[PDB]
Amino acid sequence: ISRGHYLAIAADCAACHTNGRDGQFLAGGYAISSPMGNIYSTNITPSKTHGIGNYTLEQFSKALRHGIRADGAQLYPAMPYDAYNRLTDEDVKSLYAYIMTEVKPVDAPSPKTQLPFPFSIRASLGIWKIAARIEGKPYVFDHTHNDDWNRGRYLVDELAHCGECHTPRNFLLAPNQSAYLAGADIGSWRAPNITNAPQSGIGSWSDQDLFQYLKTGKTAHARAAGPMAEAIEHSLQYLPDADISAIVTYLRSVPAKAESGQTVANFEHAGRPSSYSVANANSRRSNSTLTKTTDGAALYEAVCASCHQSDGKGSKDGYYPSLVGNTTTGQLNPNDLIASILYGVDRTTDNHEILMPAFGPDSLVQPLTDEQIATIADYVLSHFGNAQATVSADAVKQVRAGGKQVPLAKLAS
Amino acid sequence: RDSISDFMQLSAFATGHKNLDLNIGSALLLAFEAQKHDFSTQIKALREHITKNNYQDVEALDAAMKDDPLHPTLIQIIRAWYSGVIEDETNAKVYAFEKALMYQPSRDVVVIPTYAHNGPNYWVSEPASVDVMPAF
Amino acid sequence: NETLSADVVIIGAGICGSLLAHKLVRNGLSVLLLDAGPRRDRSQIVENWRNMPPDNKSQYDYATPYPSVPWAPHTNYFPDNNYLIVKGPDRTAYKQGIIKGVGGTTWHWAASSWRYLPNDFKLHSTYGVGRDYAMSYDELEPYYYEAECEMGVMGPNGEEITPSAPRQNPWPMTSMPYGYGDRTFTEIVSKLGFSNTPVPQARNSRPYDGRPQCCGNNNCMPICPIGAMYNGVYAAIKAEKLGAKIIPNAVVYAMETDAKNRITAISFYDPDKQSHRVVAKTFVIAANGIETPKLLLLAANDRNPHGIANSSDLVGRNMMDHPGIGMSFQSAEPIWAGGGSVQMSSITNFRDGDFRSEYAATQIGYNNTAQNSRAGMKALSMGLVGKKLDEEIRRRTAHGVDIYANHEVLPDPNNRLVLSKDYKDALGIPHPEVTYDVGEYVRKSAAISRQRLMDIAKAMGGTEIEMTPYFTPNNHITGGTIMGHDPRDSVVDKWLRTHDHSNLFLATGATMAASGTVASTLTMAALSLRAADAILNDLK
């Protein structure tokens, strides 16, 4: 395929500029749940009337790397232009050629984002840009390391923009570079620590495990869910193998960053050989629309025993993951676990679709109350993964509301 | 404890399978003594018989006790350990599932109805032969 | 409850009512689903079945997971509540099971969604027997397809299996692969000259709607703990999500008609026997093939002394079902039941033919429910001990084969649903009572289906050959609300609208003027959405 198409696939511009399965590709209109609210993606197809067909190379590069449209207004940081600023000029012109010469124009205005005051005006953004230290010399070949190291760095920081989610944001929602690749709450989900820390990060992960995780998102110790589900199903699964090798090579070289209260790797937790009591549901017979079954084991077997066995080691063939020794349950922060319970996991790789059902109020399988999530996550956490964390009603209700509210969001009141 | 320990020992001898869940045993003995008060005397008598006659397996024990009064209790404890139930009514109490012993000899092929086997498409493979005892 | 007024009141919050409410609320109207029973949870039904003693797993009992409410009693045939009294020499043929609640019997249904043949709608025009419908299958095709898409049904996309129901746009899934037993049955009866075909199952061969794919739990009967098959609860909560009102514990018992015979209001009881009245522009009954005529006869007004829409004396009459004879035996070769779903294959070679003028066409199907519990119970039956116990368990779970053969019954006015004058319930409602005659048609059909079952047992060589002398219940509650163009010989028309009441439509199981030969709930959904479109035209 063309260089521009590969560059767009690597940069994952398609996932955020497509409104789901429908919503013809690269027409924007897909809402990002930023702390200020819904930011609607713009249509990027070369349409002369409603698109960016009137865009020229300098304006395209400006919008791609420094966040200015043709009219002159600033683009919201929801565009990852802070990490997208470092592609070389050959890459930006390749994306130019791919956009105007390889995607069909579509004549459909995208929804206009309406932000609450004082974020309604998109003009104060220059102050945030200068305060965030985005510029930004284009990338150059570092000759201290080998070619694969530089290529992995290029994909990680420039194209795949891992730091967009795996690097925590400071008070101004700017990239806090000090904790490089240390994880952050990105809403209902949390990107975990991925540095070379043997316990907090992915330093202890085997090379084949990281390669399989980056190519498919499915391995014995971790499954890509939520933002990784979309990221892998849109950007990495089609990406060639050598670039995955470069990526893992670089991730094996990033400096370490430790998390609070970690002692073993998130995939190194043993399981308690405990289960429910079958007899207890004899008192619960002829007792439909369960509200009285409050015990953690009874709920666990009521909803989750089918896929993850009562032992918590999942399927023999591996389709149902081993909850024991799994990073999502083995992480100290149950935000991955709570988000998995609330929204399930949906990941389409090689036209084959992983899907674990959501257990939020809008579930079709078993819509179950928030206290039930809390007790179930507590049982899962104590018995099979990291027993040092807790899950309460408030945390799950917060994730239901869309993650913890950043302080800046209170200014829109 | 001593009653329950002898209970799990007699069940291991009668079922012939060493791996039995302890909670299932304690609970089955509780239901058993609930149904009849003199279950402890019967189990001590049965253990005495198996020890004195030096019965190696439950097969010879059953063959040599076809008419004695303690055959029904042994048959019924075996029934409770396998089926997981004691009574014969539709409202009886179920004391063990997914660990009841009838589902074990056909576990690898026949799926335990509410617990999933390996993967969403396992039945594409040919099954194991019927003449091999898998495990347990 | 003051008035609970709405544009449309539609009764029975099962798949019928849930689909009707979802389609109506997708067009922006006011809708009142009501149901006779409370809510239930999938996980609780799962746990209730989990702790239910395996003796009723040996003989197929699907109900006790679902509790029975005293105000709205549902049929149980292990120890009987005497809710459904059935009489006649073929009484056992009508031992039909139902569940009342949010989802109905469709809470626990085997997900065998099927299409009828066009000939099935013109039997008397084709064979001079049975009855003809008020419309044709081509009229119902697009409704049938939209139901198939909505429920998420698998199907045999590319196969010229038998002369069967034509399709216009193909099936949004591909059938999951057979288990071992289905393949064995297919090959042995291909040798026997019988044509076995995949059943179309409203399940997930792949993730869809947001529900994971089927894990082969083999517990579609009665309930999957994964939600990989369609349930009426899906459409129920979907309609609720768009603003439609649902009411549990609403047991309709009376209704009122004005001078134009149009229904102004109906009246229901709560569990506390409080009477509450509901008024709406449109009145439609979607409850059951037994519940709907029960309600019609129960509230016979002064304008309608004999019953609602009973000016032709055809409410509850002409009671249809599929007379079935089910068989269980031990195979010479291992059959290994328990792979995948609970039904995956059926013999459809005898679903039509010129023989239909003389005897009934039959459907021979196979039960894929796991025989492990039956094997364990039967092994413990003769008190066998030790390793031999496990060997017998394994051979009985690997050699147990379950078949059934259903027939087609002609409309008989004597097949009736009198309200019992001897039994009553917590609300005082007269309990249903049916009187079934299988007819010489089905007797002649069974005279041949029996030979067919003897051949199916002999060619594969079963032992312990067990045959019931009676007809088994196939639970397809059709007839009682016959279609037609003449008001003097029918109750409802091609648009399901009653002849006596232009305001009353009937989207019930009893609607089918013929029982057909295969499963007929998907026909019921197509009819329900046709009634939805009729209501749309009426109110817009």
Ligand SMILES: Cc1cc2nc3c(=O)[nH]c(=O)nc-3n(C[C@H](O)[C@H](O)[C@H](O)COP(=O)(O)OP(=O)(O)OC[C@H]3O[C@@H](n4cnc5c(N)ncnc54)[C@H](O)[C@@H]3O)c2cc1C
């Ligand atoms: C064992 C068994 C196997 C079956 N197998 C198949 C099969 O393979 N294929 C197939 O197609 N079908 C099969 N069926 C049939 C199928 O499951 C049901 O017929 C289907 O769910 C249709 O039911 P319904 O929606 O009309 O009624 P339901 O959804 O069951 O009931 C509707 C609701 O009406 C309410 N109601 C009733 N009377 C009143 C009243 N007077 N006032 C107020 N509310 C009232 C009740 O509360 C109930 O919840 C089977 C049925 C059984 C029992």
Ligand code: HEC
């Ligand atoms: C650039 C290609 C990368 C790389 C190499 C990684 N990330 Fe992510 N990721 C995101 C979230 C929310 C999670 C956690 C999911 C959960 O809690 O269940 C992850 C997970 C990972 C892992 C697994 C490590 C672990 O501890 O589980 C790894 C190795 C990893 N990531 C590396 C979300 C995102 C993004 C959201 C916008 C971005 C971009 C990336 N990840 C990018 C990358």
Ligand code: HEC
């Ligand atoms: C979902 C994350 C995301 C990624 C990844 C992304 N974009 Fe965008 N893009 C946005 C958002 C959000 C905006 C508008 C932000 C604003 O208005 O401040 C935007 C705006 C733009 C604009 C301005 C057009 C207009 O009408 O506003 C251009 C040009 C653009 N992006 C190009 C690209 C290119 C090229 C890529 C490389 C694939 C890319 N984007 C990747 C989200 C993304």
Ligand code: HEC
């Ligand atoms: C069979 C449907 C199904 C249900 C129901 C289910 N799971 Fe899972 N779950 C899966 C599958 C499949 C995956 C991994 C997806 C893949 O590999 O494609 C998964 C993944 C997970 C994950 C995330 C693993 C990761 O690395 O991201 C967690 C946590 C989890 N399951 C826990 C639970 C708990 C707790 C419950 C019950 C309250 C539950 N699941 C119910 C099938 C299910």
Ligand code: F3S
């Ligand atoms: S029980 Fe469930 S896993 Fe499949 S076989 Fe039936 S839908």
